[PDB]
RNA sequence: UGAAAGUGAAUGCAGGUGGGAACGCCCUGGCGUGCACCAUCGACCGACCCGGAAGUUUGUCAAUGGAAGGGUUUGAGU
RNA sequence: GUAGAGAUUCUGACGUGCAAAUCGAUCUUCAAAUUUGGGUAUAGGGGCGAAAGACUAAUCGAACCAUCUAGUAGCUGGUUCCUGCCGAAGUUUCCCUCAGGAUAGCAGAAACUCAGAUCAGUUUUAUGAGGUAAAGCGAAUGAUUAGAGGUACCUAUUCUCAAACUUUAAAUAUGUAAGACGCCCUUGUCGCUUAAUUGGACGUGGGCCAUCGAAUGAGAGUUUCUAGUGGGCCAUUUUUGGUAAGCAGAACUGGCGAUGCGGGAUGAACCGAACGUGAGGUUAAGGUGCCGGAAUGUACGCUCAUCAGACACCAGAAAAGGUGUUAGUUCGAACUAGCCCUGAAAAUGGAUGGCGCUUAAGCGUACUACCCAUACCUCACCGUCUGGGUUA
RNA sequence: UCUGCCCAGUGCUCGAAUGUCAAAGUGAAGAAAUUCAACCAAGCGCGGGUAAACGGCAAG
RNA sequence: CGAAACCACAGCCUGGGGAACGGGCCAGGCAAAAUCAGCGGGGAAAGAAGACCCUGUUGAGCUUGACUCUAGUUUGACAUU
RNA sequence: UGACAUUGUCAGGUGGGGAGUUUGGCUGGGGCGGCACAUCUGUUAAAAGAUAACGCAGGUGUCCUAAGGGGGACUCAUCGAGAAUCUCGAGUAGAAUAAAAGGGUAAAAGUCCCCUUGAUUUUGAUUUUCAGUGUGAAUACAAACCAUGAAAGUGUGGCCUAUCGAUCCUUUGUUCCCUCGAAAUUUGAGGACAGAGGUGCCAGAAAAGUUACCACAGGGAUAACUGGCUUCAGCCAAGACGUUGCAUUCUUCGAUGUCGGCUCUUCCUAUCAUACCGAAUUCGGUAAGCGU
RNA sequence: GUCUACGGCCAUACCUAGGCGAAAACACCAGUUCCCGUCCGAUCACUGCAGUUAAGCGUCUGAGGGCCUCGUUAGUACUAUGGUUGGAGACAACAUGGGAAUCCGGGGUGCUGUAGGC
């Protein structure tokens, strides 16, 4: 699916409270931090004899992810997030029909 | 089985034969108030605001009025109780119950008879009564002499 | 599946409506089923007997049960009600005995019970003998191949006039 | 037997298909918001005007 | 009441409305009167979304502070 | 070949033995990888094994002892006095759930509230909704027989069909209404709505005011906690898969399960009727030759069977015939029916229940009398519940 | 009396890429916690040997 | 002189119905003490909570490139130095 | 021989030699298959709603910045007529409408053009599956913000009926937010609020075999084994054609000993022989006494 | 009564052939500078009344097609309930009730509301 790189949509930032142009990009999951509480608890739990202490997931059944649009206000820099339907092939600002 | 919203709705949501086309506009020119008793008849052309197939042919009382729809309250048997179902149904799928209008016309007539009975100093029995057995009557035979009939002999028509 | 019986009219199927006045029906007496192979075997028996006795020009035979009901695909059968006509033979008044015996022999090819009934209607038409005579007498019946056209009060006038010149339009 | 609806209607009618209790006043909440707002103000003036008349 | 920081329950006879126990008055009702309980419309307290009046001192332009007022949102509240 | 060490066969004896492995005969070896005493070493996830998972104190695909340990139990078994009162479920949704739980239903208790209300597995009246049966195919669609006409066609016809074709369209089911939370008039609030006190919603103040607005019958309703249940089965009718099935699967209702009694000889669901302890009377279903309570009753016929028939469910037979016979129909001939016979055919001796029954004690119809259930009726008594009294 | 053919695979065995490479240690950034960057044995991986190795009939 | 197994109660058949092969139930055939030696038709005879099969979120033996580990082994680092 | 090497600690790799565990369910027994395990249309289905089978005919894990939204003009599939692809007649949809099927659609919901991003933010209320829990999908509004149109109005994705996801954890957005509890500042972390990442066994364990050496607790809820039920003789005329007849899982898994032969007795007739008849040795009828 | 605008019910209104239509209205019609749109002012947009009732439009006619209503079909098919009814069954009959559809035949061929013009 092709999504235009820019769109005029409502900006819920308090400085805008109106429709404003937003730059559209694709949300990328951030790098996992070693110092998160879950990561720290996992390292504490995994240290020592006992083998594996947590479920490890294999039965990956989904083939595509919900694409997430990161809307970025041109005026007040406010950032919004929209989720769309699942798509196998995704374009951002491709050629119009 | 499949359990969609419009499953097995081929005949009930179908538009009538030679009744297809454009919806008549007296539907939109009608007024509904809360307390009105209305019938639900899902018009298949208008897909927005369609109540579920259970409510087709169901009659209820209006409880809410919006710009384009009507809130109808219907009692649906669920296991061992009637549960209050409040469907937001578009006015195309709605019509006034003629039974209510017949009742209101009868109420107006009853008040009229009561007023005239009071004015005349008489008592008028306002309860309807079921059909009674026929009265005694004479049946005249003049120019209507009885014709004696016998069962016909069996024959092979074809 | 293909039905075993393929021909459904035998004899002079082009015979005029006036030529064969007598009609004899082999009628099912029971609510039952008839197989396609049963229908064609009785058809062969009826055609063989009738052509042997009176010849191919003395009768018109029409089997009216069509094997349209599928049995569960392997074959086709004819679902028959009570009183439904299975076989029909139209002949002259002389061939009454021949047609009756032919249907009597063809009973043995069909399961269940059948009755031979001499229909009081003229030939294969729906009109009884007396009303067919009287309507033909006053002129609303015109033969058309194996059947006859009947004047009806509906339609235009000039077209009915030049198709039916003897008709007396009151 | 995986499924049947044999004894279910009997079980329903033993305590009867009971109807919900009828109340004179139903929630003006859960209705149209604009109507609810104005009816609050209309009710508030009505009770005050009754009080003033009394 | 909220995750917390924190804030923290009377516009009114501690409101209206409907039905209601018991009582009173009148000629069976009517009229008052309404406990208890539900239906419901509000008021108040905390969150949530706005709105920032004072006031405090420290950055007075500000920093901090939160009043009135509005949402028809919410709580295991008054 | 003997002693000795073995243990092939009889698949002999015995097989609660003499014996928890023995005896008899037969057989294998018999001077060496031989047989064997005592001493000594190797101990349990170990030993030892010319290897069979063999052996390791009658215990070995992990010895024995004691403890953890009363290990765990969706699994099997059992679970102890009486009467009275009420009385289920095998269904819903979710679960690594399918022999199990939770959840809803059904049930019991304990309360509270309302009240001529507030309703009903009901009818009527009024008014909706549906696409099944039926019908149709010369109304579209699909399939299909035959000629006629005008030229692969076209036109008027014709025979026959559809579970996912259909214009049409039932019966049975199903929704709602049938007033006092009513109606009529006046009039008030609003930030909503309108061109507008214009409406809409809620009200005030009045008037109408239990034939108060169909029938019939009932007092009605709401909380709280919790049990058991979450294998069902049969029949009526409808219906699917199946060659069929005492087969598998559903729908509606009634039953059995949980239920005795009368009857069908006998039987969980068939027929009748549902049950406190009794007396009398009367019936239901079904019966009245004898077993067996009760007419070897009445009336009119049919039937003769060389292995007749005899009561629903039900414990089974068809086409087609039969100089069997009794009646009919239409022109002696054909048909048409009712009974009988034929078609009809198994294995312990045996089944209308038996005995027997032939102008029946068989079959069809009609009419009386009779017999009898725990059902009905009257009465007595027991208990339960409900209602009304009781400060003498 | 013979014991054939096959090193593809699998297993065993022994030479080179430098592709990988943990903890140490080295360099930079930060106030540090640390975050980056480069290097690293073994095992690999690539390459040679091996069937009286498993196996097959890469060889048929 | 003197056991034991086994034992709901018992013990003549045919048929019916029935959890679809009754000793009992229903309808029949029938039916006279007390016993002895034989016998193997029946008592679906006795002998062991089927040892085949399935079920259980019950095991164990063995196997492998199952999951997860571990003795050992191997290499790097620091220590000893 | 030698600061090598061995040892102690750590970090890589190896490790069925050894340890512990697991090895989904549904299922006309299990197993193999299929996925009926999450879901849509038409049926099954008996004209409300509900309704089953490893019943039936196809589908779903996508696709689309337009194929979403608004406005405007236009009319479609066809068929006839005719000019070296457009021409005009008829044309109730016989076409198209992303994708299965069903329904809807004609100055449109189809086809072209024009402008857009309602495929937005924030509540509550409803509908369907339903326990009236959750998820999913949907409906009517209210408070903003917009698109479009002259306007009425329409628009909270697709004409309607499918196209999907908890706790924990991780990550992202938001606030000039809260906390790190002796007091601070800067990092870092933890919170509230809104999403995403994934559980297809789709209300969501992290899991290979084998057992003929096998073991338990059960099961006739469930197979094998025993039982039961179920699946040649005419009629017809041209001996053909026809037509009518003679798997299930109820019992048993606290066990009913499970082929054949031998032995032995009995019954049956659907008669090989024997007796006695009827036709033209052969075909028949009576016939199970007797033998085989 | 006729005509126009806006409608309601949405074929008794539609389709086809033929014959009429006085007034006004309506329509066809003249033109392309303007607003506007096209390959083409043919459509659409704009300005006007020189002619025509030829068409549209109204109406009458066809035992026209269709459609609508009534009767026939027909108390028929079907169906709720009932029987220890019949029949081996298929199915049928009866009892107390409910009750169609096609063919066919007759009639009909739009009614009406508001504001106006004649």
From Swiss-Prot, chain A:
Coiled-coil ranges per UniProt: none
Positions bearing N6-methyllysine: 54
Ranges for the region named Disordered are 24-54
Question: Which Gene Ontology cellular component annotation is one that this UniProt entry carries?
Answer: cytosolic large ribosomal subunit
* Sorted UniProt keywords: Cytoplasm, Methylation, Ribonucleoprotein, Ribosomal protein
Q: Output one GO MF annotation.
A: structural constituent of ribosome
Please give the superkingdom of this protein's source: Eukaryota
Any keyword Ribosomal protein?
A: yes
Keyword set includes Transmembrane: no
Subcellular locations according to the entry: Cytoplasm
The record's listing under Gene3D superfamilies reads: 3.10.450.80
**What are its GO biological-process terms?**
cytoplasmic translation
Q: What does this protein do?
A: Component of the ribosome, a large ribonucleoprotein complex responsible for the synthesis of proteins in the cell. The small ribosomal subunit (SSU) binds messenger RNAs (mRNAs) and translates the encoded message by selecting cognate aminoacyl-transfer RNA (tRNA) molecules. The large subunit (LSU) contains the ribosomal catalytic site termed the peptidyl transferase center (PTC), which catalyzes the formation of peptide bonds, thereby polymerizing the amino acids delivered by tRNAs into a polypeptide chain.
Assembly and oligomerization: Component of the large ribosomal subunit (LSU). Mature yeast ribosomes consist of a small (40S) and a large (60S) subunit. The 40S small subunit contains 1 molecule of ribosomal RNA (18S rRNA) and at least 33 different proteins. The large 60S subunit contains 3 rRNA molecules (25S, 5.8S and 5S rRNA) and at least 46 different proteins.
Give the PANTHER family listed for this entry: 60S RIBOSOMAL PROTEIN L36A/L44
Q: Member of which family?
A: Belongs to the eukaryotic ribosomal protein eL42 family.
Query: What is the protein's name according to its record?
Result: Large ribosomal subunit protein eL42
Q: Which gene encodes it?
A: rpl42
Curated annotation (Swiss-Prot), chain B:
Q: Where in the cell is it found?
A: Cytoplasm
GO molecular function annotation: structural constituent of ribosome
Instruction: Report the main location listed first in the record.
Output: cytoplasm
Query: Would you identify the family this protein belongs to, as annotated?
Result: Belongs to the eukaryotic ribosomal protein eL21 family.
Note, other: There are 2 genes for eL21 in S.pombe.
Report the protein's function.
Component of the ribosome, a large ribonucleoprotein complex responsible for the synthesis of proteins in the cell. The small ribosomal subunit (SSU) binds messenger RNAs (mRNAs) and translates the encoded message by selecting cognate aminoacyl-transfer RNA (tRNA) molecules. The large subunit (LSU) contains the ribosomal catalytic site termed the peptidyl transferase center (PTC), which catalyzes the formation of peptide bonds, thereby polymerizing the amino acids delivered by tRNAs into a polypeptide chain.
Instruction: Indicate what this protein is called per its UniProt record.
Output: Large ribosomal subunit protein eL21A
> What's the source species for this entry?
Schizosaccharomyces pombe (strain 972 / ATCC 24843) (Fission yeast)
Swiss-Prot record, chain C:
One Gene Ontology term of the biological-process aspect is: cytoplasmic translation
Q: What highest taxon heads this organism's lineage?
A: Eukaryota
Where does the protein principally reside?
cytoplasm
The answer to keyword Cytoplasm applying to this record is yes
Q: Name one GO cellular component term.
A: cytosol
The alphabetized UniProt keywords are:
Cytoplasm, Ribonucleoprotein, Ribosomal protein
Which Pfam families does this entry report, sorted A to Z?
Answer: Ribosomal_L16
Family affiliation: Belongs to the universal ribosomal protein uL16 family.
Q: Which PANTHER family match?
A: 60S RIBOSOMAL PROTEIN L10
The role this protein plays is:
Component of the ribosome, a large ribonucleoprotein complex responsible for the synthesis of proteins in the cell. The small ribosomal subunit (SSU) binds messenger RNAs (mRNAs) and translates the encoded message by selecting cognate aminoacyl-transfer RNA (tRNA) molecules. The large subunit (LSU) contains the ribosomal catalytic site termed the peptidyl transferase center (PTC), which catalyzes the formation of peptide bonds, thereby polymerizing the amino acids delivered by tRNAs into a polypeptide chain.
Its protein name is Large ribosomal subunit protein uL16A
The species this protein belongs to is Schizosaccharomyces pombe (strain 972 / ATCC 24843) (Fission yeast)
Name the gene behind this protein.
rpl1001
Swiss-Prot record, chain D:
Q: Where is the composition biased (Basic residues)?
A: 1-22
- Indicate the family of this protein: Belongs to the eukaryotic ribosomal protein eL29 family.
Give the molecular function GO annotations. Answer: structural constituent of ribosome
Keyword annotations of the record? Cytoplasm, Nucleus, Ribonucleoprotein, Ribosomal protein
Q: Which domain of life does the UniProt lineage start with?
A: Eukaryota
Instruction: Tell where it localizes.
Output: Cytoplasm; Nucleus, Nucleolus
A Gene Ontology BP annotation from the UniProt entry: cytoplasmic translation
The protein's name: Large ribosomal subunit protein eL29
Could you tell me which species this protein originates from? Schizosaccharomyces pombe (strain 972 / ATCC 24843) (Fission yeast)
Presence of the UniProt keyword Cytoplasm in the record: yes
- Keyword Cytoplasm listed: yes
Q: What would be one Gene Ontology cellular-component term for the protein?
A: nucleolus
Free-text function comment from the UniProt entry: Component of the ribosome, a large ribonucleoprotein complex responsible for the synthesis of proteins in the cell. The small ribosomal subunit (SSU) binds messenger RNAs (mRNAs) and translates the encoded message by selecting cognate aminoacyl-transfer RNA (tRNA) molecules. The large subunit (LSU) contains the ribosomal catalytic site termed the peptidyl transferase center (PTC), which catalyzes the formation of peptide bonds, thereby polymerizing the amino acids delivered by tRNAs into a polypeptide chain.
Which region ranges are annotated with the description Disordered?
Answer: 1-28
Q: How does it assemble?
A: Component of the large ribosomal subunit (LSU). Mature yeast ribosomes consist of a small (40S) and a large (60S) subunit. The 40S small subunit contains 1 molecule of ribosomal RNA (18S rRNA) and at least 33 different proteins. The large 60S subunit contains 3 rRNA molecules (25S, 5.8S and 5S rRNA) and at least 46 different proteins.
Q: Which InterPro entries does the record associate with it?
A: Ribosomal_eL29 (IPR002673)
Against Pfam families, the record matches this protein to: Ribosomal_L29e
């Amino acid at each position: 699916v092709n999504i235009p790189k820019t769109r005029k949509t409502y900006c819920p930032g308090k400085n805008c409270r109106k429709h404003t142009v937003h730059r559209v990009t694709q949300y990328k999951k951030g790098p996992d931090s070693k110092l998160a509480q879950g990561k720290r608890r996992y390292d504490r739990k995994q240290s020592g004899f006992g083998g594996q202490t947590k479920p490890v997931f294999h039965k990956k059944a989904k083939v595509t992810k919900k694409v997430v649009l990161r809307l970025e206000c041109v005026s007040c820099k406010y950032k919004n997030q929209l989720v769309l339907k699942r798509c196998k092939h995704f374009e951002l600002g491709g050629e119009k029909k | 089985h499949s359990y969609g919203i419009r499953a097995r709705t081929r005949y009930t949501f179908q538009r009538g034969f030679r009744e297809h086309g454009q919806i008549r506009l007296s539907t939109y020119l009608k007024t509904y108030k809360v307390g009105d008793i209305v019938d639900i008849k899902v018009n298949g052309a208008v897909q927005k605001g369609m109540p579920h197939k259970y409510y087709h042919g169901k009659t209820g009382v209006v409880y809410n009025v919006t710009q384009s729809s009507v809130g109808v309250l219907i009692y649906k048997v669920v296991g061992n109780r009637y549960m209050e179902k409040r469907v937001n149904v578009r006015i195309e799928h709605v019509k006034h119950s003629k039974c209510r209008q017949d009742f209101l016309d009868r109420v107006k007539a009853n008040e009229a008879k009561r007023k005239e009975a009071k004015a005349q100093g008489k008592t008028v029995q306002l309860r309807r009564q079921p059909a009674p057995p026929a009265k005694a009557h004479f049946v005249s035979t003049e120019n209507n002499e009885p014709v004696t009939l016998h069962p016909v002999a069996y024959d092979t028509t074809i | 599946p293909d039905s075993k019986i393929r021909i459904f009219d035998l004899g002079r199927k082009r015979a005029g409506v006036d030529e064969f006045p007598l009609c004899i029906h082999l009628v099912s007496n029971e609510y039952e089923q008839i197989t396609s192979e049963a229908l064609e075997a009785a058809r062969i028996c009826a055609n063989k007997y009738l052509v042997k006795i009176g010849g191919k020009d003395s009768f018109h035979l029409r089997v009216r049960a069509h094997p349209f009901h599928v049995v569960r695909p392997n074959g086709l059968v004819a679902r028959v009600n009570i009183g439904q006509i299975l076989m029909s033979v139209r002949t002259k008044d002389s061939s009454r005995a021949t047609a009756i015996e032919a249907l009597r022999r063809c009973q043995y090819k069909f399961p269940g019970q059948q009755r031979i009934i001499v229909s009081k209607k003229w030939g294969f038409s729906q009109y009884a003998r007396d009303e067919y005579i009287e309507k033909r007498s006053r002129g609303e019946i015109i033969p058309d191949g194996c059947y006859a056209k009947f004047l009806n009060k509906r339609g235009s006038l000039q077209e009915k006039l030049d198709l039916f010149p003897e008709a007396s339009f009151n | 037997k995986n499924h049947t609806n044999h004894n279910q209607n009997k079980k329903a009618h033993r305590n009867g298909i009971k109807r919900p209790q009828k109340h004179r006043y139903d929630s003006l909440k859960y209705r149209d918001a604009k109507f609810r707002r104005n009816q609050k103000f209309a009710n508030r003036g009505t009770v005050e005007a009754i009080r003033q008349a009394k």
